[PDB]
Amino acid sequence: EEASSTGRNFNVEKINGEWHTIILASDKREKIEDNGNFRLFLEQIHVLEKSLVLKFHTVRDEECSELSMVADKTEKAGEYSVTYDGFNTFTIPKTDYDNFLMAHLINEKDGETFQLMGLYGREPDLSSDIKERFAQLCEEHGILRENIIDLSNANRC
């Protein structure tokens, strides 16, 4: 079964655990390119009562660096917020819990904004069919495929 974090049947505890950044997408490509602040490699999601603890690592000059963030539930069901290089809110428009998780995020910094979409997998890669479903979801948010970056052969340290 698949669900949306904003859906009536969403079970947040089922997204707990191991996750890997498979593909990142953005309408501001630089944010997820080699030195962008949003090229984050997810490692796990710890589901709490009113928040999610996200553990990521970044890379610079082939060197991994750990970083944790706490995303708090907001007044909108299925929506979380977190301060990081500006103010961010995100939802999970689609997840099947056991294979993939697709997140849609809005960042607001210095009076501006950009969208970030992420495809995370329980394993360090996902099937071409799931990757195609992600490209369709990105398209529905106005993000061109050329702004979608597959990081599957670059997510391990």
Side-chain angles (χ1 to χ4, degrees):
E1 82 292 35
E2 302 192 344
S4 173
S5 67
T6 52
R8 213 62 180 305
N9 59 134
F10 185 59
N11 184 176
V12 64
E13 296 176 321
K14 287 172 94 102
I15 67 168
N16 186 74
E18 170 182 15
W19 286 104
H20 298 268
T21 290
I22 309 304
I23 300 175
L24 290 179
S26 182
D27 44 17
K28 221 172 244 183
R29 206 177 197 282
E30 63 177 316
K31 292 302 189 325
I32 56 166
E33 275 165 354
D34 283 9
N35 304 107
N37 287 158
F38 294 74
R39 170 178 282 228
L40 301 180
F41 299 88
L42 189 61
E43 298 172 7
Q44 52 192 298
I45 299 186
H46 290 282
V47 178
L48 295 183
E49 233 186 34
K50 283 189 173 170
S51 63
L52 306 177
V53 176
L54 309 171
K55 301 192 170 174
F56 301 92
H57 69 251
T58 50
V59 187
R60 42 73 51 176
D61 302 53
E62 295 172 60
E63 172 168 282
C64 285
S65 180
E66 291 299 64
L67 68 150
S68 281
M69 275 176 227
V70 188
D72 291 309
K73 305 186 57 32
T74 71
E75 287 170 64
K76 319 186 162 56
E79 185 180 74
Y80 297 80
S81 71
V82 61
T83 295
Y84 175 75
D85 195 27
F87 175 69
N88 311 275
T89 60
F90 67 82
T91 54
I92 299 170
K94 194 64 70 183
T95 179
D96 72 338
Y97 307 117
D98 319 313
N99 286 291
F100 72 88
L101 185 161
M102 307 189 176
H104 175 259
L105 175 153
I106 297 296
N107 172 271
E108 292 175 354
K109 94 156 320 355
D110 297 326
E112 302 186 308
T113 194
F114 77 77
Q115 303 184 267
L116 168 311
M117 297 205 69
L119 172 75
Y120 304 93
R122 288 298 195 174
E123 296 192 346
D125 203 359
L126 281 169
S127 62
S128 56
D129 286 347
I130 292 312
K131 292 187 178 184
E132 178 57 14
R133 285 182 67 188
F134 183 67
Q136 299 299 141
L137 185 72
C138 284
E139 184 182 344
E140 298 178 340
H141 287 82
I143 298 170
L144 289 168
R145 269 161 200 265
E146 64 183 45
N147 274 199
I148 297 177
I149 306 173
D150 183 315
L151 293 164
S152 60
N153 295 333
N155 58 195
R156 298 177 207 51
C157 291

